[PDB]
């Protein structure tokens, strides 16, 4: 069993009469009825509720999870879920993407660094004479404790509300392969350790959604290894799991993440889809950004590519 899901926002081409029926008719991809963005096969809830966050620069609902009001978040989340997915019977894939911060304190690097600072800054204002060891310990503790609370409670509420859906957080489990610090395709060792201690998340989720977006600034081999390493990590997690069988459906993009004017070549599609399939993923989801099909020219050009390259590649390796 292997199912590919269409999550490209081709609703944006409907105003020009481009409905993309061949996606399921010719290519066997699971597609919402009438190519609705949300429907019985798939539905993404982007940034629902009021997750605590730092929006570029203001603190929404506490800034960091350990200052957040859970009740307020859940109120608004319910409103959004009901708005976005009105049909109680929803059986499809439900993707939640909040993208504010990682539940592992350590993994809030780089752009996410402010979540570490503010966490630490609060502790220092209370205990000005604590040393860095104590402060770091306390900030980590508080952050991970309420960060889990916010992710776990939202998932629980989601399942309670739409109990037949297959829910997952976008991009989890993380892996961080092919970084300046982790130059192999293998996932970073400490992150694999940290993934094992996040059973609370992976036991509750129905579907793991690792993001396997390719980069142009990589070799042909590394693009395969980038994808292999992330699908391995998610498979390793899923096969250790006790509550249910967990689906691995990696998030896949037909653009190069760092070369957005360029569509994946025939060679990368074959090679990367063959790796996702051969490792035994249960399928994958094709994603796209609204910005790349916001003109009639771009819709017809995207459709040319679907029918000349993307569509055939899925059909001949997968379905």
């Amino acid at each position, epitope marked *: 069993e292997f199912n590919v899901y269409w999550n490209v926002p081709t609703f944006m081409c409907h105003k020009y009469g481009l409905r993309f029926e061949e996606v399921s008719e010719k290519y066997g991809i699971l597609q919402n009825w009438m190519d609705k963005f949300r429907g019985e096969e798939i539905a993404i809830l982007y940034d629902p509720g009021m997750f605590p966050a730092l929006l570029k620069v203001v603190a929404r609902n506490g800034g960091v999870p350990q200052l957040g009001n859970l009740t307020k978040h859940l109120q608004v989340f319910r409103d959004h879920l009901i708005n976005q997915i009105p049909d109680k019977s929803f059986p499809g894939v439900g993707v939640i993407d909040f993208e504010s911060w990682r539940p592992i304190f350590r993994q809030n690097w780089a752009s996410l660094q402010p979540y570490k600072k503010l966490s630490v800054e609060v502790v220092r204002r209370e205990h000005p004479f*604590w*040393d860095d060891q104590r402060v770091e310990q306390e900030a980590k503790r508080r952050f991970e404790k309420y960060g889990q609370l916010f992710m776990e409670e939202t998932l629980k509420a989601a399942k309670r509300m739409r109990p037949a859906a297959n829910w997952g957080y976008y991009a989890y489990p993380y892996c961080y392969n092919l970084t300046p610090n982790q130059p192999s395709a293998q996932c970073e060792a400490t992150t694999m350790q940290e993934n094992d201690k996040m059973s609370w998340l992976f036991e509750s989720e129905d579907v793991l959604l690792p993001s396997v977006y390719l980069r142009w600034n990589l070799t042909s081999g590394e693009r395969v290894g980038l994808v292999g390493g992330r699908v391995k990590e998610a498979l390793r997690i899923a096969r250790q799991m006790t509550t249910s069988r967990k689906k691995v459906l990696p998030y896949y993009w037909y653009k190069y993440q760092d070369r957005r004017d360029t569509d994946l070549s025939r060679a990368d599609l074959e090679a990367t889809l063959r790796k996702i399939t051969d490792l035994g993923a249960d399928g994958f989801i094709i994603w796209g950004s609204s910005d790349d099909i916001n003109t009639k020219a771009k819709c017809l050009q995207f459709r040319e590519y679907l029918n000349n390259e993307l569509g055939p590649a899925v059909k001949r390796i997968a379905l």
Partner: antibody
Amino acid sequence: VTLKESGPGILQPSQTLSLTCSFSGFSLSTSGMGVSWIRQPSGKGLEWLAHIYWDDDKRYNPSLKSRLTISKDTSRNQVFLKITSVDTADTATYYCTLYYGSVDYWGQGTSVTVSS
Amino acid sequence: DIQMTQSPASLSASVGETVTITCRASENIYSYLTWYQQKQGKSPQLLVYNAKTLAEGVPSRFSGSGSGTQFSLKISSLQPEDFGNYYCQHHYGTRTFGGGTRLEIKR
């Protein structure tokens, strides 16, 4: 809140220093609290020795190499400092210090003299 | 081992003048630094915590600045009582002092 250091006053090279800090208006069990031991030889700078937190977690100045032991007894409401192998360079007035929140409390200090 | 270097070792001034004594750290210590005044003693006295936050009941003429490796302590319009010794003390892990500074009354 008040702190009183107590000690031997004078002792001989090679002996063990045993200093006691005693607290009033304050419990050493209180969460987030830390006590430090600092010293100052006459006419010279301050020297940090050791630190202890309410949960028995300790810090030591690796300069002391390491002839120091810090400890506490919550029920006695006291903090202790041991210094083994004293020589004349350990001659100083010794202070204990308390930190809780934004505030900082010092004892009056106990003079310690090391000589034969 | 983190070491703290204060400069200058001595500094002479008159009442009304403004001075800035300095404290440099061997490695980075973010903002884990305190400032202390010691008069002839009298035991030491907290002036500044978290590098920049003024301690309770201390005049606004005092102020602390900087982060990481370079810190300073500015005293505006010096009052007669301000002359004495001054110490920084990091507390990143260990919590060792600098050598201090004696603020001299210019004569």
